[PDB]
């Protein structure tokens, strides 16, 4: 159970974005139904009044929280991967539009899941803003908690992979468009009951064998991190 509080741009806090530049849902409960319209941008997908200005090459940091800012972030039980997708905002996230900018699942070197490292990072993970066409975008941050993912939600709706989905309104101003954004995948639709990484038993199957759900990270993506960029406590 986790939500996005706001974003940082080049280590500068853009301030509380809830219902302002984040299409915030009414609470931190997960989406679990893979065919739900809620898979796009969670249960309250609508245009919110602000879009955060960035340029291509900026570091964009999402900041998550559980109940209050810079708390426990997400229950430690919620091991799983983190992904970030981008879509042109005029799509409203509909159709074959989501392009993957970031994936971090289980780190063999560190013996840690992305969620474990997200807690250590005070809820912060980042991407480099890609060199796409200037304009308005949705950045869809997705945490998949796998602690109940041994079952499919379609077989036992009390269990299943848990999707914590947050869509940020981002406006890309300066971009040379060296990597024009292609068509992407649909949400709902990209993940199905047979997709690798959706049904996974963390109690019985080693995390070294986990394969995150496709699609692959786009060739135009410039990278990211799971690391604290900014110290909320200094504010
Ligand atoms: Cu939870």
From Swiss-Prot:
PTM: The catalytically essential N-terminal histidine His-1 is post-translationally modified by methylation to prevent protonation of the histidine side chain, and protect the critical active site of the enzyme from oxidative damage.
InterPro entries in UniProt: AA9 (IPR049892), AA9_LPMO (IPR005103)
Means of activity regulation: The polyphenol cinnamtannin B1 contained in methanolic extract of Cinnamomum cassia (cinnamon) acts as an inhibitor of catalytic activity.
EC primary class: oxidoreductase
SS bond partners: 41-167
GO MF entry, a single one: monooxygenase activity
Binding site for Cu(2+): 1, 78, 164
Modified residues (Methylhistidine): 1
Keyword hit for Transport: no
Compartments, as annotated in UniProt: Secreted
Catalysed reactions, as listed in the record: [(1->4)-beta-D-glucosyl]n+m + reduced acceptor + O2 = 4-dehydro-beta-D-glucosyl-[(1->4)-beta-D-glucosyl]n-1 + [(1->4)-beta-D-glucosyl]m + acceptor + H2O
EC number: 1.14.99.56
Binding residues for O2: 147, 162
Any one of the GO CC terms: extracellular region
Glycosylation sites: 33, 110
Cofactor(s) the protein requires to work: Cu(2+)
UniProt KW keywords: Carbohydrate metabolism, Cellulose degradation, Copper, Disulfide bond, Glycoprotein, Metal-binding, Methylation, Monooxygenase, Oxidoreductase, Polysaccharide degradation, Secreted, Signal
Statement on biotechnological application from the UniProt entry: Lignocellulose is the most abundant polymeric composite on Earth and is a recalcitrant but promising renewable substrate for industrial biotechnology applications. Together with cellobiose dehydrogenases (CDHs) an enzymatic system capable of oxidative cellulose cleavage is formed, which increases the efficiency of cellulases and put LPMOs at focus of biofuel research.
Protein family per UniProt: Belongs to the polysaccharide monooxygenase AA9 family.
Protein's job: Lytic polysaccharide monooxygenase (LPMO) that depolymerizes crystalline and amorphous polysaccharides via the oxidation of scissile alpha- or beta-(1-4)-glycosidic bonds, yielding C1 or C4 oxidation product. Catalysis by LPMOs requires the reduction of the active-site copper from Cu(II) to Cu(I) by a reducing agent and H(2)O(2) or O(2) as a cosubstrate. Is able to cleave phosphoric acid swollen cellulose (PASC) in the presence of a reducing agent, yielding a range of cellooligosaccharides dominated by cellobiose and cellotriose.
Protein name: AA9 family lytic polysaccharide monooxygenase A
